[PDB]
Design a protein around this ligand. Structure first.
Ligand SMILES: *[C@@H]1O[C@H](CO)[C@@H](O[C@@H]2O[C@H](CO)[C@@H](O)[C@H](O)[C@H]2NC(C)=O)[C@H](O)[C@H]1NC(C)=O
Ligand SMILES: *[C@@H]1O[C@H](CO)[C@@H](O[C@@H]2O[C@H](CO)[C@@H](O)[C@H](O)[C@H]2NC(C)=O)[C@H](O)[C@H]1NC(C)=O
Ligand SMILES: *[C@@H]1O[C@H](CO)[C@@H](O[C@@H]2O[C@H](CO)[C@@H](O)[C@H](O)[C@H]2NC(C)=O)[C@H](O)[C@H]1NC(C)=O
Ligand SMILES: *[C@@H]1O[C@H](CO)[C@@H](O)[C@H](O)[C@H]1NC(C)=O
Ligand SMILES: *[C@@H]1O[C@H](CO)[C@@H](O)[C@H](O)[C@H]1NC(C)=O
Ligand SMILES: *[C@@H]1O[C@H](CO)[C@@H](O)[C@H](O)[C@H]1NC(C)=O
Ligand SMILES: *[C@@H]1O[C@H](CO)[C@@H](O)[C@H](O)[C@H]1NC(C)=O
Lengths: 172, 180, 199
């Protein structure tokens, strides 16, 4: 029936992983549409969209991690990101609303395309692991800033994981 | 909290006065892109006057108060009263349920957990039906089902709408036998 | 009784859903409803239904994700039994059919009387994959279209210079593009742009 490992070629699998990370590392793809749709397209307001410390693991920890715990922590972080992204998408407006306001639907398209990208990255991490086989209430203005900081932290984490993947080139 | 009021629903075109309480000095205050002069009060607190406010977007024209270290602000929602339901008609297909179609009319420019809730009620029997958050586009003129009451043909329906700013109604008398 | 289909192939357009086709086979005078299964190693997607208008093609309802091996196969069923075709797995990035480079323009130079400069605009796929082009040109009165050797246009770029066109004649140009490694499908020909050499 369904194959346990989606592929058996280590080289093409690692290439797919590296390409996925390098593609998903796009702040202009993910974060900027959020700032544009939330009305924060003002220089000083955009200046405050900075990641808070301790949101995502550090580059030193990703470097220190091996080849199994690294994949496990990546899977867990992607799960948490999927949860918070489902929450955000629940909070985001609709297409007719964006049309009546004057915003761009491309932001909604990019978000609804970025979620299955996370799903596919989780799938590919599973394939690689198998191939190895060895706040009561918040303000309507505070929620936007929280989402922006979360997206910036996610972009930093994507950069870190992309560099980590590009580090180890080829191995049996 | 530092800015007042917070998440207030107001009518488009009316005046409103904001206020910010803080010990440290405030540099400037913005309403989206437009800037506004500050009115000094007792101490470091400042206030701003808004007159003839335009229609606010879905996210809301979030007024911000910028200082040297951080940023504070709230959201305001400028909307309209609900329009009277238009083109109300009811008919039957199998003489078991009655579907009443209507048009929402002019847009209220308010969405989220503040949309206009519609409720159709019967006069002779006092039974009512309430629409859930599932809202269809105007493209498909609004409809709601009403179970036909046994041994009764004359029906007199009155629809009621209500938002956080107003309410509207409409009445129709129908013979359920001639609407098949 | 119908028999199993074959000739399965799938193509992905620029930023759209992936469609797949197959063959009809022999006719058995019995109604048949075709359906193909598409699934990842862990995720099982929805199914298609062969429309009565075109029983050999459907458009999936899920967004395409590149660099993930998906396994697709068609299962044919009728009132007398069911049978499944062969199972293939392919990276959806290898089936992409990009768009032609738009905004083609020809600009000459007032220094040499034998060269022409070509400018165009690549689509958004240039950020995902490296792509190659084929530049074809011809003289205004000559109907035969000559082709520049592809060895000079084997990488991504947005400018190129033609040579060896001495006396004061007009030329028309066109260009297409596909994936660099040759895997996929060639795009359509762009709009023809004219240009007159220097005198
Ligand atoms: C990756 O994290 C998930 C947590 O969501 C682990 O659990 C799997 O979750 C999926 C959800 O679709 C289930 O289908 C699997 O059956 C779950 N597996 C187990 C063992 O519970 C998943 O195991 C993690 N993957 C790896 C390789 O560690
Ligand atoms: C139809 O039902 C309404 C109750 O929903 C009856 O009562 C009228 O309600 C309207 C409100 O839309 C008032 O303006 C009228 O003054 C009410 N009239 C009375 C007599 O109470 C209404 O009478 C019913 N219509 C008929 C023809 O019986
Ligand atoms: C509502 O409709 C019914 C039928 O559609 C009407 O009943 C009819 O009344 C006429 C008398 O004018 C009879 O000749 C018919 O046989 C009746 N049809 C039936 C019983 O099916 C009823 O009068 C209508 N009500 C009003 C207020 O117009
Ligand atoms: C508010 O502004 C609109 C247009 O900007 C104008 O038509 C209207 O008269 C103004 N209202 C008041 C009270 O000034
Ligand atoms: C399907 O058949 C055609 C000719 O009938 C031929 O291109 C090949 O055998 C099949 N095509 C593909 C893409 O497999
Ligand atoms: C399609 O054809 C099969 C063949 O018998 C039949 O069982 C089925 O009811 C048809 N319709 C659908 C929706 O599958
Ligand atoms: C060509 O460029 C112009 C402006 O440089 C702009 O309309 C668009 O990018 C392109 N338009 C077409 C029709 O290709």
């Amino acid at each position: 029936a369904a194959i346990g490992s989606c592929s058996k070629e280590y080289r093409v699998l690692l290439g797919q992983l590296q390409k996925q990370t390098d593609l998903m590392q796009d702040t202009s793809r993910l974060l900027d549409p959020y700032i544009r749709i939330q009305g924060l397209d003002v220089p000083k307001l955009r200046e405050h969209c900075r990641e808070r410390p301790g949101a995502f693991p550090s580059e030193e920890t990703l470097r220190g991690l091996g080849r199994r715990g690294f994949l496990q922590t990546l899977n867990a972080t992607l799960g948490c990101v999927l949860h918070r992204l489902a929450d955000l998408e629940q909070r985001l407006p609709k297409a007719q609303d964006l049309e009546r306001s004057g915003l761009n639907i491309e932001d909604l398209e990019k978000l609804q395309m970025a979620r299955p990208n996370i799903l596919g990255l989780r799938n590919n991490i599973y394939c690689m692991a198998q191939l190895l086989d060895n706040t009561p209430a918040s303000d309507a203005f505070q929620r936007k800033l929280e989402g922006c900081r979360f997206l910036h932290g996610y972009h930093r984490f994507m950069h870190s994981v992309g560099r980590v993947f590009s580090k180890w080139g080829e191995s049996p | 909290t530092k800015v007042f009021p917070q998440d207030k629903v107001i009518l488009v075109g009316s005046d409103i006065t904001f206020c910010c309480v803080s010990q440290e000095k405030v540099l400037s205050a913005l309403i989206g892109h437009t800037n506004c002069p500050l009115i000094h009060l007792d101490g470091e607190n400042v206030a701003i006057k808004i007159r003839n406010i335009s229609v606010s977007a879905s996210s809301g024209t979030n007024v911000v108060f910028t200082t040297e270290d951080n940023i504070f602000g709230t959201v305001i929602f400028a909307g309209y009263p609900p329009d009277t339901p238009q083109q109300l008609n009811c008919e039957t297909h199998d003489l078991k349920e009655i579907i009443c179609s209507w048009n929402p009319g002019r847009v209220t420019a308010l969405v989220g957990p503040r949309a206009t809730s519609y409720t159709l009620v019967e006069s002779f029997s006092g039974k009512y039906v309430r629409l859930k958050r599932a809202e269809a586009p105007t493209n498909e003129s609004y409809q709601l089902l009403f179970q036909m009451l046994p041994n009764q043909e004359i029906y007199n329906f009155t629809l009621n709408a209500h938002n956080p700013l107003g309410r509207s109604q409409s009445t129709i008398l129908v013979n359920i036998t001639e609407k098949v | 009784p119908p028999e199993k289909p074959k000739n399965l192939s799938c193509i992905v357009n620029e930023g759209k859903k992936m469609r797949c086709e197959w063959d009809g086979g022999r006719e058995t005078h019995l109604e048949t409803n075709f359906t193909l299964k598409s699934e990842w190693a862990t995720h099982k997607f929805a199914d298609c239904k062969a429309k009565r208008d075109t029983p050999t093609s459907c458009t999936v309802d899920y967004s395409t994700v590149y660099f993930v091996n998906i396994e697709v196969w068609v299962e044919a069923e009728n009132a007398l039994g069911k049978v499944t075709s062969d199972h293939i797995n392919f990276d959806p990035v290898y089936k992409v059919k990009p768009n032609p480079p738009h905004n083609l323009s020809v600009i000459n130079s007032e220094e040499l009387s034998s060269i022409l400069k070509l400018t165009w605009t690549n689509p958004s796929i240039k950020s995902v994959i490296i792509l190659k082009y084929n530049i074809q040109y011809r003289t205004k009165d000559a109907s035969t279209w000559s082709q520049i050797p592809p060895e000079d246009t084997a990488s991504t770029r947005s400018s190129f210079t033609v040579q060896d066109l001495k006396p004061f004649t007009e030329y028309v140009f066109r260009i297409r593009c596909m994936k660099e490694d040759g895997k996929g499908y060639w795009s359509d020909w762009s709009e023809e742009a004219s240009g007159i050499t220097y005198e």
